[PDB]
């Protein structure tokens, strides 16, 4: 029901997340995806690397600059997985794709916003325990992405700032809960409890 839905991409399966997001964009929901470098693909790392190398094989023989373009970043890998599910050569498909933003890490202003998850695409809820899986950041680094360390350092700095913010918020929440718990005996509180609130 949010005007913009911010999805934390960590722990999600790429195909199922791409399917649900493509349907949301076609229905007309604005979606931002963050932390694409923490996405997961089921199956082993060598298998997924082999599939990407087959994709790398694909190219136009007489002029490589016309051929399929092999974008290495995890956000672009996810974008390819979603563009394959959107009919992107039509005006409707282009308009649906223009309701989507994908980023590595969490840049501003989304670092101060609420981030949600998609349970039907979550790895711990979908995959059977013991099945191997692949991390998108490692796959992208193996196929040529060169910004994993920069993203890691920036994410660590963001995590420190967010931990300090959460500590202050938890102290305030404890104070509010203490102030609210001492008024549970009032007649107003009894009436609200009778009505269910």
């Amino acid at each position: 029901v949010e005007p913009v839905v911010v999805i934390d991409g960590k722990g999600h399966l790429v195909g199922r997340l791409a399917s649900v997001v493509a349907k949301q964009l076609l229905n007309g929901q604005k979606i931002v995806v963050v932390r694409a470098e923490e996405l997961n693909i089921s199956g082993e790392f060598f298998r997924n690397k082999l599939k990407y190398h087959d994709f790398l094989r694909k190219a136009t023989a007489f002029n490589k600059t016309r051929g399929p373009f092999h974008f290495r970043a995890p956000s672009r890998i996810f974008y390819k997985a979603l563009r394959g599910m959107v009919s992107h050569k039509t005006a409707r498909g282009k308009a649906a794709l223009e309701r989507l933003k994908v980023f590595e890490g969490i840049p501003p202003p989304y670092d101060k916003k609420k981030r949600v998850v998609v349970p039907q695409a979550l790895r711990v809820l979908r995959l059977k325990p013991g099945r191997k899986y692949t991390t998108l950041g490692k796959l992208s680094t193996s196929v040529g992405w060169k910004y994993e360390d920069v993203v890691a350092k920036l994410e660590a700095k963001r995590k420190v700032s967010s931990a300090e913010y959460y500590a202050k918020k938890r102290a305030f929440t404890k104070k509010v809960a203490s102030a609210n718990a001492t008024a549970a005996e009032s007649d107003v509180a009894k009436q609200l409890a009778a009505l269910g609130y």
């Binding site: 104070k175 509010v176 102030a179 609210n180 001492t182 008024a183 009032s186 107003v188 509180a189 009436q191 609200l192 009505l195 269910g196 609130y197």
Partner: protein, 137 residues
């Protein structure tokens, strides 16, 4: 402090006497007792107090509760009812925050328009009192 320490990781156990909450079907929202284990996925349940018939059910159709009591394996419906009454399972369930949450959900769903207006008014009064108390500390 020269003793080994291992985390327990407590789980609800599928066993005879385990109290289950049925979440779908004809008897959704009621309590029953596990009388006998059939296999990894199916058990036998009996719910004589809430009107749940003695039946074989899939474990995915119920959710285990922390409550448990003493029950012989394969006990008939009358024995299950007697043991349920002796252990007083219903009161111990009603005292839990889970059942209070269920009751609150049902009460809020059953509220009317006038009652929602009264809830808003009472919330405003409580908000004024709570904010006044909180600003001092």
């Amino acid at each position: 402090s020269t003793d080994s320490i291992v985390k327990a990781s407590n789980w609800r156990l599928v066993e005879v006497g385990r109290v289950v909450l049925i979440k779908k079907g004809q008897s959704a929202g009621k309590l029953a007792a596990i009388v006998e284990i059939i296999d990894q996925k199916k058990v036998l349940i009996d719910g004589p107090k809430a009107g749940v018939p003695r039946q074989a059910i899939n474990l995915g159709q119920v959710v285990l509760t922390p409550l448990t009591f003493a029950l012989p394996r394969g006990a008939r419906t009358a024995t299950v009812s007697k043991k349920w009454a002796a252990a007083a399972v219903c009161e111990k369930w009603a005292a839990s925050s889970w059942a209070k949450k269920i009751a609150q959900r049902e009460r809020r769903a059953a509220l009317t328009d006038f009652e929602r207006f009264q809830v808003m008014v009472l919330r405003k009064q409580k908000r004024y009192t709570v904010k006044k108390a909180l600003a001092k500390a």
